[PDB]
């Protein structure tokens, strides 16, 4: 203990020696002194404190001179010592409890306390705590006489004025609740006010005090009743003989001690209402009997604090019913009616004590009316009481401002909760009350009312809080606000403007009359009440309802509770409240509300009006921008068209120069800066509003079109460098995304929620205008100049201190798995929100250079792979498992989605990182990457780390899940419920609008009451089951889009890995076999189902097969033997896939390239002729079906398909002949003639010069003529070719008939032309030779009909960019043609 005392002694001596970095020190130490007190108090409560420490502690109090904050810290420790050694509850010997009675009470034993009032408080406590011990002897009658004497003298010495001063100075909320201004603050105070220091008191220290003050209050009431009943008669009768001296008001101060004690704590206040026979409940009966006007107030200040709970408040309400009279409602309402006549004629004036008594009455009314429903339902409609009329009449007459406020808080307390009936009734009182006093004029009287109520802080803040509550719907805010938030008839008698007269007042206060206010704490609370009003008006506007009625099948009034959709837009304040936000003064008030001292804001409380006045000002700017598009388009033209029909008009408050809310905050450059500096203050809900406003500011075409153009380069960017905060707020965001997270608080934590709000800001800012440097670039640490990034040396980025690196750092530390508790879905979403930023930052040309550079230095590709987990069946997400009864319903679904998107973003980087390496960067990286993709990582070298293989990360597909085979609601079934929110391209949905429609049919049937109540509950379920069905189909559709997107990343990853790394060695030859081992079970499984995924898998198989370009070890053979095994069952599935024609031409074009190479390179000593036989009989096993597909593909719109189809046929005929001298009988050629392919083939030769005019259509025809030649080699082939009139097609073409920017030298264009003739000449040659003399007449007619051309060609052959080579590559084509005609003539 004495160490604790000496520790506190050192703090006070430091703090007093320091007053004779500076402010935060006092803040730091004062709190440390406040903790040691709470810890010492705990120690005394444990019976380990000793009688010795008590004698020393009392000595410190007897010496203590200055009444300060340090003294208050020791009050709970004092009452702990007293309750220990003094009370019987404490285990203190009676002789020892008597022993210290003299040490405290006797006086004249060093009892010249440096603070005489303090010693009076110490003495009063022990007596109250010790007299109860003598309950259950020596000198009882004398002791009690001694007790009451030294107790009464202590009260006059200033005891209760000290205990009350501590209770009042202690629980000092640094913001002034206007509803309880001046309450309990009218009693005289001989105590000197605490010094000017801003030293607060812990939210706990206040509580610990009010616990001991309950023990003090409980002690005096239970142990010293007669002392209180000696004080009732002393001052009550002395009030009549000596009314002027202000006789001892200690009993009043005692009731305020009770008020401060039980305030906020209804658990303790129940001891006053639990047992009516207890001393505490008997006390309320006792104090309420008589009504000394100041003593009544002190009693009502006690009840207001004895009703913080609905249970305590209901009891207090019953206490004033009485159903020797106590104080009752009957008595209160009589005086409320007795003084309303002393004003609305006494002359118009009231006594201060009488006026105060009324305030304590209207304050008790409000409190009991808000906390208890019974009290509200009673007071609001009782005739013997008649509350509404008297308080409304009292407000007409001349009264003090504070009293007129308390009336408005009573009306608010009556409207804090309400029905649609009590709202119309209240508005009938308010209408008449505002229309006339009850000529001065009906509406001109309404002007006088607002000018009064908005005159001072006390009323204006109070009256606006009443107008705020009147617009909160009966069903509760955030309901279906389909009805107007007030009666349509309101004002239709006179002004016809509904609420607008009240709106134009709230903005008149907020924009013009806030300037009359001077106290900053009052200016905040007023602006907070004004902004709370604007919010209530913008939220109750159902914009989803307006777009629906203006766009699709829904009723204007048959459906909604309002009498019309046009009436809804007219009467609702949204029409007018929006117009006000376009006003220059209102906006300049919104900025100056936000603009505040940062250190004063950061050193404040998160609940103080200083913080919330800024939070609420932001919330208005956000909500303004959200509801702006609906306003300017669907709302404003409806008002300017109705006020032209009705002819009515009111003053325009908006600015015609403002075409959008942006135009107002364009000029206020201080706004974007202040929004950042407030994140550095450590107030969460304030931060989230600031960041979400930076999005809508830095994601709007206007404000991003006013920072760049002026000369100025970028205004908002340099504005962060103006005072030098651009780096200090960027440093704060770093500590925010580095901050710790609590698994218990989980998805809704201050740290976690601030992270997502930053990652949503940096992304939302980058996604817009991604090719120009934005705010998000500068805050990330990139040095931002025009259209160019860069790192400033000795800057937070170059030294790896930037925020950007903190996004990497948080990534390489996440553990999104809690050992079979599942992948916490809130945490995998954190990973995605970070990655998608980095993704945008390696796709844009600005960042890819700087980012891919820094991602290399940091080993980013490795840390992600080191932490990536394998997808598995029994791998739960959020505790939920895939393939559950309904997995696509919980927030675990969207967590699996985000994980697939996160994986794809990793493969995409590993791909780009595997291309930036191949060009030059040493094989140390490609080796590291490649082994990291097989699972061999050597960071520390002690041993190689085992990471799952890139083929184990092929875990994002199991073809049996059938996500696409869960049904969608039939579009007519939705249309019959008039649901037209469905989005297309499969079908997607808008859950929100759809659920909005179902809520409007619910109120349509609920209010109509035609069929109820059970049918309602069944419909209430089917709606919840429909939107439950819709959410599954749009999340499944959202999963397939994310799974396919991932397949392209894993697929495209293997491609970049095949082409960079050459495969000739066994360990590599073993890798590609491992790859082929993983894609085949999948591609084989659903090459029939659908194409989109089969295309990506069939594409890695192609590129793979074309990489085995073809002295060995005994292991490499067993490898290749397993590759030839897989390549066969690949060739098989490609054959079955083609024969079915299951995929699009672009996919089968990929199938034909796989078969072509398997027939070209693989199959082509006698073990190869066997391979030809097996491969051949496998093709022709499918009959003409397989050939039909390849044939009609050779004549399709797809140019790449018909080329691969024609080339595949060329290889099919080639391998059947190698299987079967040169004239034989082929089954394939006989099939083609049957399918009429050779017919349409020869007939497609007419436009040979049109198609042949390196060109894509050039190579397709080159494959066509290579096939014709293949056919004409055999006898039957040359027959089927010629039987289709071959020579006829060669004549109608006219190719045998002796250049505008086509990008080749001319010399190469001719050899292509000749090469066409080279092919055509060989085709005719093979045809004449194979058939026989049957076409020697045709072979003769062919030359006689084209003679001369042969003569020129037969003589042309006889006789350095590329020209020498081109002439060689041409003159040889003439040597081939001269030989083509030479072998034709001699064979003819
Ligand atoms: Os429609
Ligand atoms: Os004006
Ligand atoms: Os289940
Ligand atoms: Os590339
Ligand atoms: Os959704």
UniProtKB/Swiss-Prot annotation:
Subunit structure: Component of the nuclear pore complex (NPC). NPC constitutes the exclusive means of nucleocytoplasmic transport. NPCs allow the passive diffusion of ions and small molecules and the active, nuclear transport receptor-mediated bidirectional transport of macromolecules such as proteins, RNAs, ribonucleoparticles (RNPs), and ribosomal subunits across the nuclear envelope. Due to its 8-fold rotational symmetry, all subunits are present with 8 copies or multiples thereof. Part of a tetrameric NUP192-NUP170-NIC96-NUP53 module.
Keyword Transmembrane helix: no
GO molecular function terms attached to this record: structural constituent of nuclear pore
Subcellular location per the Swiss-Prot or TrEMBL entry: Nucleus, Nuclear pore complex
Lineage of origin: Eukaryota, Fungi, Dikarya, Ascomycota, Pezizomycotina
InterPro entries noted in UniProt: Nup186/Nup192/Nup205
Keywords: mRNA transport, Nuclear pore complex, Nucleus, Protein transport, Translocation, Transport
Organism of this sequence: Chaetomium thermophilum (strain DSM 1495 / CBS 144.50 / IMI 039719)
Record gene name: NUP192
Protein name per the record: Nucleoporin NUP192
Signal peptide: none
GO cellular component, one term: nuclear pore inner ring
Function as written in the Swiss-Prot or TrEMBL entry: Functions as a component of the nuclear pore complex (NPC). NPC components, collectively referred to as nucleoporins (NUPs), can play the role of both NPC structural components and of docking or interaction partners for transiently associated nuclear transport factors. NUP192 is located to the NPC core at the nuclear membrane and is essential for de novo assembly of NPCs.
